[PDB]
Each structure stands twice: as C-alpha cells, then as structure tokens.
Amino acid sequence: YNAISLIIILPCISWLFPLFFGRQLGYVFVTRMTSTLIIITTLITYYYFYQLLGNNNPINLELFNYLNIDYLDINYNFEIDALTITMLLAITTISSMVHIYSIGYMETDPHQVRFFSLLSMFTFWMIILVTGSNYFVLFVGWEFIGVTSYLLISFWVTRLQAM
C-alpha cells in the first residue's frame, strides 16, 4: 500500500481502460467503473491530507531518468507538498462529484464511454501537473490538460461552433 503511488496510478487506470475496453465493457459498466475508481482516489487523498496534518513530512517517489545531458538532469519525480495536497483534494473532490453528476446528466447521450474516459484523463493529467516536482513534469501536465481541453470542448464533433 503506497499513498503517493495510488494517487498517480488510479486515474491512469481510469483513463486507459475505458479506451482499450470500451467496446468490450460498454457504457453502463465503464461509467460506474470510472467513477468508482476516482471515488477511491479521492478517499485516498483525503486520508493523506489527514495524515500530513499530523506531521509536515511530505513524500516523493522517484522514477527513471528523463534526460541526462551535461549540466542538466530531468527526472520523473512526484511529491505531494502542502500546496500540492491543497490543490489535490480540491481537484479530486470536484473530479469525483462531476463524474457522479455526469452519470445522470449524460444518460441519453450516445458516446459517454469516450466522455468519461476524457474526463478521467483530464483528472489524471491534472494530478500529474500538480504532483510533479520539477518544472518539466509541470510542463507535461500543463500541455496535456490543453490537449484534453481540445478533446472535451469539441465533444460534439458534428457541431461547428464546438470545433
């Protein structure tokens, strides 16, 4: 059990699985699954905020090297600051509630598999944007939320003004 790791990995599961298995699982399953997983994520981040109120001792996880060139190293490093947990609980709470809301708001729309997948990839790249611990991971999340904003504002591809 790793609290710093589940915050990252659970919305990525919640995104990658509605795309690769949307035709196989279907909208009535993928809706409940995507929301279920974001609910578990936001419960974990409430609990982590409750623990960091105990000691102000943050956690980072380290991964492999992005690039090592001469004077410049970039690593995938992820820490939850007090500032990070402040943004994190807000974005996960609003995320989970908008997921539950869109269960019932999108009931007669066709393409809600793609819709809930795009909502949780938006959540996921937001998580990555806030929990990153250099400026590079901040840039990565910063761009991918704009890519998701393209894919979300243009959800009705038939509509011209949306495109």
């Binding site: 992005y66 690039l67 090592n68 060139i69 410049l72 393209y150 591809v157 038939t158 011209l160 949306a162």
Partner: protein, 243 residues
Amino acid sequence: MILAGLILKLALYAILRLLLPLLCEAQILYTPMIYIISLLTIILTSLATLRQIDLKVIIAYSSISHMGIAILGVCSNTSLGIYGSIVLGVAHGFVSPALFLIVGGILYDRYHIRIVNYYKGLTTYMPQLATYIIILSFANIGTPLTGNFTGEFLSLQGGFIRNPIIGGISCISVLLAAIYQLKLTNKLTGGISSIYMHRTNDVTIREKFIMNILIISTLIIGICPQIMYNLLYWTVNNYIYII
C-alpha cells in the same frame, strides 16, 4: 516518405559531419547569418502554411519549420543543441512519414483528390483514422512525451544560449507550429460528414501496423530520451569549439 524522413536528416547529418570539424573559425563568424536564415525560415514558412488548399503541401511546410528548428540546434555551439537536433531529426523522421501516410495512403487511395475543401467530418465513419489524425497532430506540434518536444526544447535552449534574442523570437515556433496543424486537424475531424465523400473502408491492418510502429517509436524517445545517449555522448562533445 523516404524524402521527408531521410534526405532532410541526411543534410542535417552533413552539417555536423562536414562543416563543424574543419570550419570552426569560419562557423563562429557566421552563426548570426545562420540564425537570420533559420529564424526567417521558421516564421515565414510556418506563417505561409495557414493559406494552403492542398493537404500534402501542409505537411511539407511543416517539415520545413521543424528542420529550421533543428539547424539552430546544430549551429548553437552547445552540447544541448547538438543532442536536441539529433533527437529532433530522429523523432521527426518517425512522426512525419506517418503524416504522409495519413494524407497519401489512407486519404489518397480512397478518394484520389487532395484538396482540403472536400474533407470534413471524418470521425463519424472513420473513428480510428480520426484517432490517428489527432494523435499525430499533437505529436507533430511539440506536445511532450513525444521526442519532437525533446528535440524542439533542447534546440531552442541551445539557440537561446548562443543568442538570447533570436532564441526569444524562435520560441514562438511552439505557437506557430500548432496553429496550422490544429487548424487542419479540426477541419478533418470535425463537422457533419462530407457530402462529397462517399463512405469507404476504415483503416486496414497494414496501415494500422505502420502507424502503431511510428507512434510507439516516438513515444519511447519521448518518455525516455536517454535510450540513445550511449551513442551520442562522444559526438555531443566532439563538435564544440569553446576554447
């Protein structure tokens, strides 16, 4: 595909292999002229793509703008710029023939015209082609975890070291490269399906095979550009003339 994946990168290889070793004292005198020409071929070509009626011509002008980014990486006198120009050349040689396959293989075999005005609303009959089109558009822009951003970022950084003002006006290529690419992509994917196009087959197994290979090989360089540092760490120090 062979042209825009290999010939342009061959001349990018020739400027390292032929000029930087025995024209060092010349090269220092001339890098402001190269920066004039490379900023001026980023801006003016990236701007001239906005008014194009044809579809393969847009990806040709895209290749101009990316090679203009790579030349101010090699001519930067920096280890970062040399490495970023090599990453840009390799990642561009991946992602651009996939775009030429999108326009020339999946789109010209089916309809035999290349004008932009016939193509609208390709998602509703071809959802995974549209998936490919948007993934490749963002991969071509400089959207990170792609290898194109690693090349563009390190080449812009080297060009900022060698001259900060032409680095400042060369950094707007991030904007200019995205304008025409997304302007094409939302026209192709969005809208009601075209009344000119009759519905054809979706993308086939061999086209998806070529696309999947050319997308994985950008994503691996984009997630970890270190995988080919073991070849280059000599040659990144070899061409530097900082006395």
